[PDB]
Amino acid sequence: SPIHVRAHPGDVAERVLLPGDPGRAEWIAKTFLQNPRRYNDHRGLWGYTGLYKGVPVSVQTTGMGTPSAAIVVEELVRLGARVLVRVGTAGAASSDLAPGELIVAQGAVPLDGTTRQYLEGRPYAPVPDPEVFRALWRRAEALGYPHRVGLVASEDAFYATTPEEARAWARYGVLAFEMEASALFLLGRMRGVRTGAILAVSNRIPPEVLQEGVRRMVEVALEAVLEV
Amino acid sequence: SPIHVRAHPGDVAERVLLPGDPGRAEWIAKTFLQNPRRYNDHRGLWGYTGLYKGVPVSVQTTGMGTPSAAIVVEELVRLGARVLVRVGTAGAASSDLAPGELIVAQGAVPLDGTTRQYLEGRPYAPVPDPEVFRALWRRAEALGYPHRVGLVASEDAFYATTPEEARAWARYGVLAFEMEASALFLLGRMRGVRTGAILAVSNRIGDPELAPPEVLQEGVRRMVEVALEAVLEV
Amino acid sequence: SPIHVRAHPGDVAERVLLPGDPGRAEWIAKTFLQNPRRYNDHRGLWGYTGLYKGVPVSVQTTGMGTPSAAIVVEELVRLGARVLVRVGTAGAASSDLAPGELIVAQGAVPLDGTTRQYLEGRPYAPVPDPEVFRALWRRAEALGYPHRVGLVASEDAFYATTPEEARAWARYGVLAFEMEASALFLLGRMRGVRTGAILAVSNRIGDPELAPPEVLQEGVRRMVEVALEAVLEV
Amino acid sequence: SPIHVRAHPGDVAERVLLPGDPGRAEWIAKTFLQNPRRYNDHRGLWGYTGLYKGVPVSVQTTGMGTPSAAIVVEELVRLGARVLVRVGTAGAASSDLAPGELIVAQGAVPLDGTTRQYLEGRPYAPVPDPEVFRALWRRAEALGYPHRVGLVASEDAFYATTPEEARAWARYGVLAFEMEASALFLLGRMRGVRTGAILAVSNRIEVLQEGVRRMVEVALEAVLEV
Amino acid sequence: SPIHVRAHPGDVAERVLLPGDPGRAEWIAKTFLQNPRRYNDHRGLWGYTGLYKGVPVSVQTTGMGTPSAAIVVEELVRLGARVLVRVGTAGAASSDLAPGELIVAQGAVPLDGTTRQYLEGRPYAPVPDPEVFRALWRRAEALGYPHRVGLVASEDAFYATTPEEARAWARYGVLAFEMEASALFLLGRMRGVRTGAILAVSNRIPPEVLQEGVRRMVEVALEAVLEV
Amino acid sequence: SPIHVRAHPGDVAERVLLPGDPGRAEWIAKTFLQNPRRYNDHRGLWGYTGLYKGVPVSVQTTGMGTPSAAIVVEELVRLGARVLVRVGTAGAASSDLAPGELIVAQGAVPLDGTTRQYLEGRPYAPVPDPEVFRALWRRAEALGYPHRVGLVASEDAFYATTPEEARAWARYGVLAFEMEASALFLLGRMRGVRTGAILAVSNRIGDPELAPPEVLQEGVRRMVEVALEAVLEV
């Protein structure tokens, strides 16, 4: 059994959603999955496996930051995960992005040290698996949910980035900041698995507004993993 | 008029293909466009504008390397270019890529100093415009041409990269190596234009020569056709 | 109220223990504290406050990695935390360290991107508050549990470090690897609060599994007792 | 035959001038060389060979940027080139440089990614071959053309450098900016050939044409000396 | 015989003080040691050995900067040095430090190229040997000499650092700047020897005020090396 | 008065030789200068001023390493130094260089942290003043002393460089390693003064000891003669 996600291969489905908040993992499992079973609660990394339209799907908590996410992804891959889609929130890098809007991550600027360590400081362009990316985009359109498609930036120091710095990055295509995508994308290529990310804007660097965005994001992710 | 591409607005169309070789730019203009007109020859950066299925389309030589490509892209944008698609050859990093095969660039690892200077050494993920990327992929599928979709790596030193380094990069998703995409993708975001890149594999890293001129030529034709059909969609 | 640790200033004590595992935080609170109350469970970041030998003490989950720990530390300071001692596990880099042994962190090699971001890539020597460090060392000596005093390395990629690399770092003084110390130490100086870290060796770099639960749990108990005794000394 | 400069060893002389612009390569050939002949036009990298005062001299287009120049220099070396002198224009970083003024490059600050890739990010001091440098300086003095001897900076992003940054570099000895010297100098040492660079200030970050003419005359006289 | 410190086995004691100034090395030897002897003067790196309270103790000039200090340390270690304590001055980065005040270095921010070369550019946290560090702190206390315990920054370009930059570093815990500690600490760990550093504030980025500081500093270092 | 070189404007001439070893500075002052006077001995940074062929020349000890040399150069400039030429020894990186052979430094690879700090990590090409460089070269040729003209590398960690790394650098043009030139050259441009460097090979990297004092001493003599002649010509 893996060190942090203490489960066995048979407990995890090939298709996995990756929320950062365990509270959100629980909500997703109970709201969208049939017969959800929590296969792991060790370290608070709540992980569930259930069925969505007859297809097994797991929802695994990653925690915050690429170091935590990388540990979870590495172990999930060992457990048989083949398609992994991060679902979470992100702070808008510019004033034009309103809370609740969806972002299909086309790539992730690696401002984190986890990718840096794996890469030994070499340049890189973290991108999702092309088919998963395409599926997320298509499903968002099919469901008629407004969304943006583009870059996000994965950072390490939540409280270091100033609003001015965020807007500076926006001039380079960065739509929002989060703390997990870059590592997920890198590991997707390193470990030969398919990955993707879709986010809901929670603030610009409204209870029902954000929640509806999260619900849409999850629905899109679930529909997309069934497409691959 | 710009310093290098000495054209005047009106000469350049909103949609532009970006081959690296001027001889290829000429061939593209005469082979696919109706009423091809050369608007620039300064510094050998041959540029043409003609009609493709009734739509204005320019073909502009970028030269080799991101510094050259960046100068050309910057000036084209200043002239009103809106959609720019690089078309060229690339060296396969894996043994899974057969010569003549097409690669729709999903992103470009920035191993070049041009993006580095523009970014002041900061990390970045050079990616094409999502719509252009999608169009290139869809067109390749519609025309039934075999293709791979994924990362390429943009380098500065053509003769520095070894087969060992190439295979190492392939383990991180790099399909092939070329020398212009990263800067094109970065400028696309910086200057607000829609960019993309589609390449034809001309060889494997470490090869003294390029694949058969025939197998490559058919790849170049397909690549160009896909690019043309794509820019019309955006 | 803070974004992640959703508590109110009155909920958190000046003295706080920082385990990485929420299950460990719960065990510490229930095992060592009188009148323990959980003031936060949002994001699974379980935080408790109780009394230890008549002195208020909080136990706050940090999660794994400096990005998570930094968020928790920044918010804890806003909530009134003044003395923060990390208590966690570490993978021995040397063969000299055995599972269950304690390590009082004299400093932390910053192999993480969180300190790097705060420092804008500049060099630094993450070190605990001197008084806290002194108290942890003194208490470890007094209790008599096997321990070492020295450097640890705070890394981001748990699964990237090979046994070969670990041994190389040991030649430079690194006793073990963990994933939070560097950021805590940096923030201690930046925010003007007193920090420290004591760890229990849970394995050797390269091991597929952690040491026997019995061994590991005893090491954890010893480490917490030392930390609790130490925070009362400052 | 090399991949980009599709020439034969017999086509390239031991002494080569390296202009960046093909139109300038042509002008140099037809203006200074006897019986000039073009041995390559592939990829627009026009290369010519002719006689200068009875000595064979080639004029090869490098294109813009160190990546393009490195490809050209690597191939020229494989073709037998022994002495390579870059001739081109530069953007003055300092105010004391007037348009048309000549600069004999003593060294080149490597702000480019090509030298960075060859060096794997390690520090370096790109310098020309001692003898070629000495000859360029001496010839510029003989012909009596106003010149300066010092550092230039080779960059990748033509449109990224601001006047403020240029002025900052000038405080460290940078006289002007260009985009090829660093890689040429590095390859000179790496490949065992003699390189040098002389430039004509075309701007501040027939005036320029005369500078170009003087620049070329100096280079031709200098390569004959080595 | 070593290349720079041209001494031989038998000239250097296991316990060594490392002043940067040769004039100070001389003063220390004549002032605190019995039957002092200068075993080296080559390159001005004056080195002496004598007895302090019956214990052999060497006083070796390091010169200025980590490159010079690394050379001296490497050679001293080869000659038998096992406990090395740097004694010297530093420029206060903060406004709370008064000239002559003592600083027991808990660690040294590596802003130098010597440590960088040895480490091949990798991150590091230069710290003294814990026992020596502890001894210096304890002796300063026992002797009742006012002292501060914390970080110093080891730099290469004495004249490049501005008061503004110094103040910035102070906000990160840097008490003062000097030019030798980082390399001493790194080599201590690399060569398996015990090192430490105690400094007297000489300025901020009075003769007897500083001299008394220097005297207290040396006395503390001497007592500390006998303690380990 | 400067902090380290405790002298005053009057003690130092416009022309200065910069040996690293104070014992060599003394030997030079007494062997080539007339009416030599030592104006500083603080920190063992022995500095003398006398007349060479009726011209005032100073000989100032720099110490070892760019940090020490940088301090000395900065203060010398404040004291009125206008032409400064380093004279010292170097470890051959190549196998073709023989102990005692001279090297006129055309440039210095900056592998040191001093220039890095001054430059804030930016790339640079440390070079001497062109006229001083020319003077040294011409003088060496005139006197007919065997010499080489080219790059040296200025390093910080004398004991870190291996023969293997030295040989690798030789393939990129590095003739020998030393520890001061890069900073001297950089400050020359920064402070607007004329600098240069001429060295005598004292050993080949990897050698436990230097070459015979005889062979080496003669090299040192020629080097100083060349340097002294040169400074009087600019």
mmCIF file of C-alpha atoms in Angstrom, chain A residues 3-4 6 20-22 42-45 64-65 67-68 71 74-75 113-114 116-118 155-161 179, chain C residues 3-4 20-22 43-45 64-65 67-68 71 74-75 111 113-114 116-118 155-161 179 208:
data_model
loop_
_atom_site.group_PDB
_atom_site.id
_atom_site.type_symbol
_atom_site.label_atom_id
_atom_site.label_comp_id
_atom_site.label_asym_id
_atom_site.label_seq_id
_atom_site.Cartn_x
_atom_site.Cartn_y
_atom_site.Cartn_z
ATOM 1 C CA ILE A 3 2.646 5.675 2.051
ATOM 2 C CA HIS A 4 0.065 8.493 2.047
ATOM 3 C CA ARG A 6 -3.360 3.974 1.994
ATOM 4 C CA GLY A 20 -7.834 20.057 -3.458
ATOM 5 C CA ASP A 21 -10.285 20.286 -0.554
ATOM 6 C CA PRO A 22 -11.391 17.049 1.189
ATOM 7 C CA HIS A 42 -5.354 8.765 6.094
ATOM 8 C CA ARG A 43 -3.768 12.215 6.522
ATOM 9 C CA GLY A 44 -7.166 13.682 5.698
ATOM 10 C CA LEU A 45 -6.573 12.890 2.026
ATOM 11 C CA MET A 64 -2.819 22.281 -1.256
ATOM 12 C CA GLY A 65 0.339 22.819 -3.309
ATOM 13 C CA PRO A 67 4.278 18.936 -3.303
ATOM 14 C CA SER A 68 1.107 17.440 -1.799
ATOM 15 C CA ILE A 71 2.641 12.774 -3.801
ATOM 16 C CA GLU A 74 2.383 9.505 -7.983
ATOM 17 C CA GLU A 75 0.587 7.143 -5.614
ATOM 18 C CA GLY A 113 9.460 24.105 -6.933
ATOM 19 C CA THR A 114 7.997 20.622 -7.352
ATOM 20 C CA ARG A 116 11.554 22.425 -10.744
ATOM 21 C CA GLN A 117 12.940 19.566 -8.644
ATOM 22 C CA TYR A 118 11.670 16.870 -11.024
ATOM 23 C CA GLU A 155 2.505 28.843 -7.600
ATOM 24 C CA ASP A 156 3.951 27.862 -4.221
ATOM 25 C CA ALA A 157 3.634 30.981 -2.060
ATOM 26 C CA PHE A 158 -0.053 31.869 -1.827
ATOM 27 C CA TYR A 159 0.704 34.914 0.332
ATOM 28 C CA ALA A 160 3.690 36.163 -1.676
ATOM 29 C CA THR A 161 1.982 37.020 -4.969
ATOM 30 C CA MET A 179 -1.264 25.641 -6.832
ATOM 31 C CA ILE C 3 -9.197 31.870 4.227
ATOM 32 C CA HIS C 4 -7.989 28.379 5.110
ATOM 33 C CA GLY C 20 1.625 17.677 9.199
ATOM 34 C CA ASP C 21 -0.915 14.881 9.646
ATOM 35 C CA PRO C 22 -4.432 15.816 10.913
ATOM 36 C CA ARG C 43 -9.993 21.783 4.328
ATOM 37 C CA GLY C 44 -9.174 18.999 6.760
ATOM 38 C CA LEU C 45 -6.710 21.343 8.478
ATOM 39 C CA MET C 64 2.275 18.294 3.413
ATOM 40 C CA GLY C 65 4.739 20.601 1.682
ATOM 41 C CA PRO C 67 3.140 25.695 0.151
ATOM 42 C CA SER C 68 0.549 24.207 2.506
ATOM 43 C CA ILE C 71 -0.444 29.177 4.181
ATOM 44 C CA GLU C 74 0.863 32.918 7.716
ATOM 45 C CA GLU C 75 -2.714 32.559 8.939
ATOM 46 C CA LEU C 111 15.207 22.774 -1.735
ATOM 47 C CA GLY C 113 9.953 26.631 -4.220
ATOM 48 C CA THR C 114 7.958 28.358 -1.491
ATOM 49 C CA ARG C 116 12.349 30.564 -3.272
ATOM 50 C CA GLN C 117 9.252 32.576 -4.193
ATOM 51 C CA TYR C 118 9.300 34.596 -0.952
ATOM 52 C CA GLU C 155 12.122 19.379 -0.466
ATOM 53 C CA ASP C 156 9.121 19.631 -2.808
ATOM 54 C CA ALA C 157 9.258 16.365 -4.784
ATOM 55 C CA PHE C 158 9.032 13.472 -2.309
ATOM 56 C CA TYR C 159 9.334 10.880 -5.074
ATOM 57 C CA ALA C 160 12.183 12.562 -6.964
ATOM 58 C CA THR C 161 14.967 12.054 -4.406
ATOM 59 C CA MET C 179 8.938 19.015 3.517
ATOM 60 C CA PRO C 208 8.992 1.506 -0.001
#
